[PDB]
Amino acid sequence: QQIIKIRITLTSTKVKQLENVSSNIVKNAEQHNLVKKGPVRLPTKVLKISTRKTPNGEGSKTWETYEMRIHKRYIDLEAPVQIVKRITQITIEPGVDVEVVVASN
Amino acid sequence: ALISKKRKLVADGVFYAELNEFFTRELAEEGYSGVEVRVTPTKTEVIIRATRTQDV
Amino acid sequence: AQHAVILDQEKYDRILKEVPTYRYVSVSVLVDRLKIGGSLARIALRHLEKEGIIKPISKHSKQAIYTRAT
Amino acid sequence: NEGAIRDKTAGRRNNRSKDVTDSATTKKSNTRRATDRHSRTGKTDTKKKVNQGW
Amino acid sequence: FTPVVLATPIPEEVQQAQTEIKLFNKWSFEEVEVKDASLVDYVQVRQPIFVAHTAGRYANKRFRKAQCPIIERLTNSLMMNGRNNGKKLKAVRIIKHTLDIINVLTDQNPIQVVVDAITNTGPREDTTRVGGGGAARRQAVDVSPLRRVNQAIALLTIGAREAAFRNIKTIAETLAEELINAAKGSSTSYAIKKKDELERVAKSNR
Amino acid sequence: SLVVQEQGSFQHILRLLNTNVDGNIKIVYALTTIKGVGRRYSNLVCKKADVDLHKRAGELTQEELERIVQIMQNPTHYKIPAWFLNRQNDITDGKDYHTLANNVESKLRDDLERLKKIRAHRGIRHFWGLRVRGQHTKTTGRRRA
Amino acid sequence: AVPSVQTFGKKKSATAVAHVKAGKGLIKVNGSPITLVEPEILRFKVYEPLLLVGLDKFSNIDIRVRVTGGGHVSQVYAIRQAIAKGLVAYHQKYVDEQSKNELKKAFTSYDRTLLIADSRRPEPKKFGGKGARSRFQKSYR
Amino acid sequence: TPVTLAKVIKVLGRTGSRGGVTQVRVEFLEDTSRTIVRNVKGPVRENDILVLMESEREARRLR
Amino acid sequence: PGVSVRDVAAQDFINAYASFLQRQGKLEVPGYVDIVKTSSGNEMPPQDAEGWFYKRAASVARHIYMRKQVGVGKLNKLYGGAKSRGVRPYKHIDASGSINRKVLQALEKIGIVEISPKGGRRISENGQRDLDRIAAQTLEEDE
Amino acid sequence: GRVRTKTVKRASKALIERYYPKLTLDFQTNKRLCDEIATIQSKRLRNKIAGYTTHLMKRIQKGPVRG
RNA sequence: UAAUUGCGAUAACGAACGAGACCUUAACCUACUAAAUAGUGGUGCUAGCAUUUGCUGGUUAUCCACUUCUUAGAGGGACUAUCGGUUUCAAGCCGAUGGAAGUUUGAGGCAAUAACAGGUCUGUGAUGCCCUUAGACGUUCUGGGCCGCACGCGCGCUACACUGACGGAGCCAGCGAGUCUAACCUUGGCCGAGAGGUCUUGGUAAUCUUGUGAAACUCCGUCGUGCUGGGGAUAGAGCAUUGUAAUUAUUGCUCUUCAACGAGGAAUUCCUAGUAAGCGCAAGUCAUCAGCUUGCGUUGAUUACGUCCCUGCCCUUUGUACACACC
Numbered sequence A: 001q002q003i004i005k006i007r008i009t010l011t012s013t014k015v016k017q018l019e020n021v022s023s024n025i026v027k028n029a030e031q032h033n034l035v036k037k038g039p040v041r042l043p044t045k046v047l048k049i050s051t052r053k054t055p056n057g058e059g060s061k062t063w064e065t066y067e068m069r070i071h072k073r074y075i076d077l078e079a080p081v082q083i084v085k086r087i088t089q090i091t092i093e094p095g096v097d098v099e100v101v102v103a104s105n
Numbered sequence B: 001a002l003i004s005k006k007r008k009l010v011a012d013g014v015f016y017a018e019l020n021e022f023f024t025r026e027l028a029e030e031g032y033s034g035v036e037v038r039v040t041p042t043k044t045e046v047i048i049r050a051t052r053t054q055d056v
Numbered sequence C: 001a002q003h004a005v006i007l008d009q010e011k012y013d014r015i016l017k018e019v020p021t022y023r024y025v026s027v028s029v030l031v032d033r034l035k036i037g038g039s040l041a042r043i044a045l046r047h048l049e050k051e052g053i054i055k056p057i058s059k060h061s062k063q064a065i066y067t068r069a070t
Numbered sequence D: 001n002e003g004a005i006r007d008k009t010a011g012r013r014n015n016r017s018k019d020v021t022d023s024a025t026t027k028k029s030n031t032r033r034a035t036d037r038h039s040r041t042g043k044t045d046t047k048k049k050v051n052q053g054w
Numbered sequence E: 001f002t003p004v005v006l007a008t009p010i011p012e013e014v015q016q017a018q019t020e021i022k023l024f025n026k027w028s029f030e031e032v033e034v035k036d037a038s039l040v041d042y043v044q045v046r047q048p049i050f051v052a053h054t055a056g057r058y059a060n061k062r063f064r065k066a067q068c069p070i071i072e073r074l075t076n077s078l079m080m081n082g083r084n085n086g087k088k089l090k091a092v093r094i095i096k097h098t099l100d101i102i103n104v105l106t107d108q109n110p111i112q113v114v115v116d117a118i119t120n121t122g123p124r125e126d127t128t129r130v131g132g133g134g135a136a137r138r139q140a141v142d143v144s145p146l147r148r149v150n151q152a153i154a155l156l157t158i159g160a161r162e163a164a165f166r167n168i169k170t171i172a173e174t175l176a177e178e179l180i181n182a183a184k185g186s187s188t189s190y191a192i193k194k195k196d197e198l199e200r201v202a203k204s205n206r
Numbered sequence F: 001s002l003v004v005q006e007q008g009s010f011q012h013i014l015r016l017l018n019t020n021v022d023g024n025i026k027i028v029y030a031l032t033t034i035k036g037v038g039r040r041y042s043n044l045v046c047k048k049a050d051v052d053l054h055k056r057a058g059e060l061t062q063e064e065l066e067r068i069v070q071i072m073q074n075p076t077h078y079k080i081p082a083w084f085l086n087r088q089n090d091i092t093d094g095k096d097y098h099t100l101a102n103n104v105e106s107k108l109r110d111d112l113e114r115l116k117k118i119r120a121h122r123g124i125r126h127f128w129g130l131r132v133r134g135q136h137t138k139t140t141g142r143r144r145a
Numbered sequence G: 001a002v003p004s005v006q007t008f009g010k011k012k013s014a015t016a017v018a019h020v021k022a023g024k025g026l027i028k029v030n031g032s033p034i035t036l037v038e039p040e041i042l043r044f045k046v047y048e049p050l051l052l053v054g055l056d057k058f059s060n061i062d063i064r065v066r067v068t069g070g071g072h073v074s075q076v077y078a079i080r081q082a083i084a085k086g087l088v089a090y091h092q093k094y095v096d097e098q099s100k101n102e103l104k105k106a107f108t109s110y111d112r113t114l115l116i117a118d119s120r121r122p123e124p125k126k127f128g129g130k131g132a133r134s135r136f137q138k139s140y141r
Numbered sequence H: 001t002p003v004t005l006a007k008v009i010k011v012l013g014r015t016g017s018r019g020g021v022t023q024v025r026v027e028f029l030e031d032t033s034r035t036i037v038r039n040v041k042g043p044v045r046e047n048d049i050l051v052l053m054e055s056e057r058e059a060r061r062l063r
Numbered sequence I: 001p002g003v004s005v006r007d008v009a010a011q012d013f014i015n016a017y018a019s020f021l022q023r024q025g026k027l028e029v030p031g032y033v034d035i036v037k038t039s040s041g042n043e044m045p046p047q048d049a050e051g052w053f054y055k056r057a058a059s060v061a062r063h064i065y066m067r068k069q070v071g072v073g074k075l076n077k078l079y080g081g082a083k084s085r086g087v088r089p090y091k092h093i094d095a096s097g098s099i100n101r102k103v104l105q106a107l108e109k110i111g112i113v114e115i116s117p118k119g120g121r122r123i124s125e126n127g128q129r130d131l132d133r134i135a136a137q138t139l140e141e142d143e
Numbered sequence J: 001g002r003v004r005t006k007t008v009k010r011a012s013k014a015l016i017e018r019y020y021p022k023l024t025l026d027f028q029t030n031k032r033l034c035d036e037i038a039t040i041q042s043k044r045l046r047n048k049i050a051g052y053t054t055h056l057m058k059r060i061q062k063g064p065v066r067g
Numbered sequence K: 001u002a003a004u005u006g007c008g009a010u011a012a013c014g015a016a017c018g019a020g021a022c023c024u025u026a027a028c029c030u031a032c033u034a035a036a037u038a039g040u041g042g043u044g045c046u047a048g049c050a051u052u053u054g055c056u057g058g059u060u061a062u063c064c065a066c067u068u069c070u071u072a073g074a075g076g077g078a079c080u081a082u083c084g085g086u087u088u089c090a091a092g093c094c095g096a097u098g099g100a101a102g103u104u105u106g107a108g109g110c111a112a113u114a115a116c117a118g119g120u121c122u123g124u125g126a127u128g129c130c131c132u133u134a135g136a137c138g139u140u141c142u143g144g145g146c147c148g149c150a151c152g153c154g155c156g157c158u159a160c161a162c163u164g165a166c167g168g169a170g171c172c173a174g175c176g177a178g179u180c181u182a183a184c185c186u187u188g189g190c191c192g193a194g195a196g197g198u199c200u201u202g203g204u205a206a207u208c209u210u211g212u213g214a215a216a217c218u219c220c221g222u223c224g225u226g227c228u229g230g231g232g233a234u235a236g237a238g239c240a241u242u243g244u245a246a247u248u249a250u251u252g253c254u255c256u257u258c259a260a261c262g263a264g265g266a267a268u269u270c271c272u273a274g275u276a277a278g279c280g281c282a283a284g285u286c287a288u289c290a291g292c293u294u295g296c297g298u299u300g301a302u303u304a305c306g307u308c309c310c311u312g313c314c315c316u317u318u319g320u321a322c323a324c325a326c327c
């Protein structure tokens, strides 16, 4: 056990599934008494695509715009090596992309 | 590896589609109703939801 | 090319003696005196501010304004 | 190209001096759109084959 | 006026008028009255303002247009004809210029002088297109007070702009000549002429 | 800048380079009614001839007028960059020329005639009087010759 | 810790942050004194909030503002809203209330919105034309 | 020249094929206590003050 | 009282400072000056002829003084402007680099600007000396 | 224009009918009343109901209304 | 009423799809939980002015504090509320005050029954039938063509200038997007009149490019009404960039050449508020090429708050020999 100064990055398209896992990480750690920079939310990027609806060129020009919403979150902890490998192999979610790094760079 | 977060997330939804298709073509006679992919450590898990699993 | 591009000392003398009575002078009003074009009409707006005559009450490029001295 | 410039009967002057034909100005006018709801199959169908099918 | 300073100084004439009188670029909103009955409540003049810009929302309700400060309406109609749309900085600068010309000739708070050119240039009665059967005849009609101000504004501006086109004279100059000539109507102004010809064709067809 | 006075010393419409030049305009736009002199090349030679540009074409001492010309025909000697020049890398002697005035039309023709005498397509295009730069001829240019 | 309040004002996309603290009466915007500002026709629009409540009024307070967003004019409407707003905020939390409400009364009576953010916001362009309302053009035939 | 000033006392309706005219009853100001129905051009609300070029004349319909 | 250059309106500053570097005679004007334009997106060279290098450098210094550090690249986009494509719409374009660079390399060898860390150029401390000096002078003419 | 859809005026009708006690001429309290007493799927819709039951209540005090 | 939206009339009563509701996005939250990938004040370290103090910077951690401003979770807020007008004495409507906001708050996504021989077999490894299938209508390669020019038409771009061009100088956005077998976004440094070149560098990105220091615009001057310094078509000569390949000139740059156009006939398009109009930017195309599109913000008005005259459509009634429904 040594205090490793950790940075976790949560990124997903599903808000409920993202803030579930984030708030889950926030209470599971802080009931368990560590040093936390809580969920720090990053500007949700909206990736847009603009298309004509019709497959061919006939008809009035109807444009449609699809979008995909990417929400990104990051949580800073300092823990020992044991609660990191435990908290990060569990809390696994489909659709949430969890990233755990040790370093500032 | 080392892809943008953006391109990654759009690359993930491209994957689901191609798989969704492949299973709709392959398993049609088995009653394939759709898929979901859970990415884990060490594995990636593919769940076929189909009405006759024994021919799967 | 129509006229009034240079000096013609009579027109110098015309200017000094003809610009009282002008409650407003500008680059327009100085060509409307059947006289110099906007290049030397400006010049005269300077040289009439050399001493006496024109009191600036306005500012800048395009619109200029002056009144007679008191 | 040696043939190209040696050719009179060419160029802008010789085009400028020709009359423009009528077929240019005129509209395409469509056609046939009167007849649109009248099938040219000349066949039609049968109450039998519409009930066997549907 | 009891001057006061503090760390970053606010200058002499700046301080002076400022706290004291609410007046214009500098021009008196006191005095300056509307020479015509009606036309008040449709010519603004108190509340006083400093420069002709505003964020004003006058376009959301029918008659709030009237409450817009009169000079600002004028500089409003100044910025238009294509290229000159937007560009209120341009048009406001001209208004300060023309009023400095207006006062230059015949004193007379230039704000008052436009109040007159706007009151004299509203046509009292006009004509409309009524069928009258077949070939359309024209029923003479008494024009509303607001309209009388609108048209007044547009006419003067349109004239000045049309007038300033393609000659050495400057927009601020020609804005003044017209304003003055229409202030006490000379019929040497493009507005006075066309206020009188709408009322002349209004007398004939009545 | 100042009011000036002079005398009958200034003469309007002086002629140079076989062309005629309005006086009573500012001296730079005067030298440009010649063929081969645009606003830039005017502006550089005047600065190179040590001449006050605030002057009109009028005052402009005759000696000032012979330096203006000398510089014009010999730009590389008085140090004009030779990218500033209309005609570089001759295609026969490969010197760098500023071709001027009544000669501008001459060199133009010879250029054209080369493309023509050579059977160049670009030549054929001038010779039929059409657009050489490639542009769509189907629509534009119907008032034509 | 000196008495300090911090306010803002908005016009379109322009936001201007105003620090109003206890000071000797400096008024500067961004890096520069309130006396430049240079649209310069609109110079009085930024003078306005002072000379509406009286010039004095500011000598027990330092005034700093910094602006980002919008254009040359948009910013000018935001700093005047952020200067007016901050004055009432100060007299809110430091001087008495009847004085603050005599400051708002002196503004809101004159307004130009000094205390109230103008909600006008750009409309979305919709396909079929260059602007939000204005459609392209048609020829029929 | 006989200018006559008249205050709008009621809004009536819009007339004309185009509908760009408004029927109005006024009470003219000097020596009130007589009523006339005139036709307006621009927009009018109650209490507006109208300049009648000709004192007595009035209309009804418009096409 | 105290003074910084942010106490003086932009133009009278950069003018008095231009006239100051004109008087000065410590310059390094590259000599292609006057035979040049200052943008690929400009019609004519500048109208101040002899001068205008001291106009731009004066501005350059003023710009750099305000903010942390500014490269040649930033200067280009700044000093650039609308280029008329003729019959085609207007597009913004970067001004000429050699102008503003040798404006830096001249303000360096005059000790008014220095290479910064992080990149760019940074206002020399002898620059804030001189600048906040003539910026004092300019409200001294206005006294 | 501002008109209340049937599903708004049918709820309000259904409310004042059973709940006429409580249910006063103040929207705000009436608003919260709705939350406890009724299940409505959106903030917007609920307030629409409440704000109308307020109008109806408000003129009931001035004498009965049809329906 | 935006609405078969409602009131009301009532042999009907009470209801369902559609409208509404709903969802997304923009406006408001001195309070919720936080942020060296967002900033603020304090304190050190420190530069410059002047000042007995004070002003302006600089500083990736040097520490301490905070969440107004920036970010996004979850809540809250408007229901046309209060009051007054106006009406069947009704749903509603106008006005006022308040308010972030009172045009369905602004803007959209979704969208009943049906209709059409509308468009699309040139998006598809969607498809019936026909056609072809080895001298191929499969496919690849080489080279042209789709750009070809007496002319007719449509969407546009630039202009006729003095509300301007040109030269300095001032100097402000928002939506965006960016690179591993790879060459993407590119700060900075030097070379170059330019265009560009070159050595490095930060960025798989709230971290770097980027405050995308955009343009219109503001100010000080030069031009001074002259097809002019408005206008830049046409054309010559040269220098660069992409690409295997630039000729019929991909694009870019410098000199030169310097047309029509002096406000557009009959006509006809679009539009009501942060709109119209001016202005640029990013994204899509994409090696290179935007006068194009999709979005964005910057400047920011005049004039309606009506009618049924025109036109278009919906709705009653009326006639019919139509029902493959006036083709």
Ligand SMILES: CN[C@@H]1[C@@H](O)[C@@H](O[C@@H]2[C@@H](O)[C@H](O[C@H]3O[C@H]([C@@H](C)O)[C@@H](O)[C@H](O)[C@H]3N)[C@@H](N)C[C@H]2N)OC[C@]1(C)O
Pocket (backbone or CB within 6 Å): K177, K178, K184, K286
């Ligand atoms: C000066 N030469 C070129 C210069 O013209 C310019 O070209 C880009 C071009 O490469 C871009 O090509 C594009 O291709 C990628 C890719 C994922 O498809 C896009 O993400 C992105 O829009 C852009 N980088 C284009 N969209 C804009 C031009 N200005 O910038 C790149 C360059 C090599 O410096």
Ligand SMILES: [Mg+2]
Pocket (backbone or CB within 6 Å): E164, E165, E166, E167, E168, E169, E170, E171, K162
């Ligand atoms: Mg003019």
Ligand SMILES: [Mg+2]
Pocket (backbone or CB within 6 Å): F032, F033, F034, F035, F036, F037, F038
């Ligand atoms: Mg020439």
Ligand SMILES: [Mg+2]
Pocket (backbone or CB within 6 Å): I077, I078, I079, I080, I081
């Ligand atoms: Mg710029």
Ligand SMILES: [Mg+2]
Pocket (backbone or CB within 6 Å): I079, I080, I081
């Ligand atoms: Mg510029």
Ligand SMILES: [Mg+2]
Pocket (backbone or CB within 6 Å): I084, I085, I086, I087, K158
């Ligand atoms: Mg152009």
Ligand SMILES: [Mg+2]
Pocket (backbone or CB within 6 Å): none
């Ligand atoms: Mg429904």
Ligand SMILES: [Mg+2]
Pocket (backbone or CB within 6 Å): none
């Ligand atoms: Mg500090």
Ligand SMILES: [Mg+2]
Pocket (backbone or CB within 6 Å): K067
């Ligand atoms: Mg906050």
Ligand SMILES: [Mg+2]
Pocket (backbone or CB within 6 Å): none
């Ligand atoms: Mg009521």
Ligand SMILES: [Mg+2]
Pocket (backbone or CB within 6 Å): K117
């Ligand atoms: Mg068909």
Ligand SMILES: [Mg+2]
Pocket (backbone or CB within 6 Å): K120
């Ligand atoms: Mg198809």
Ligand SMILES: [Mg+2]
Pocket (backbone or CB within 6 Å): K121
């Ligand atoms: Mg087929």
Ligand SMILES: [Mg+2]
Pocket (backbone or CB within 6 Å): none
């Ligand atoms: Mg096929």
Ligand SMILES: [Mg+2]
Pocket (backbone or CB within 6 Å): K122
């Ligand atoms: Mg095709």
Ligand SMILES: [Mg+2]
Pocket (backbone or CB within 6 Å): K122
């Ligand atoms: Mg086909």
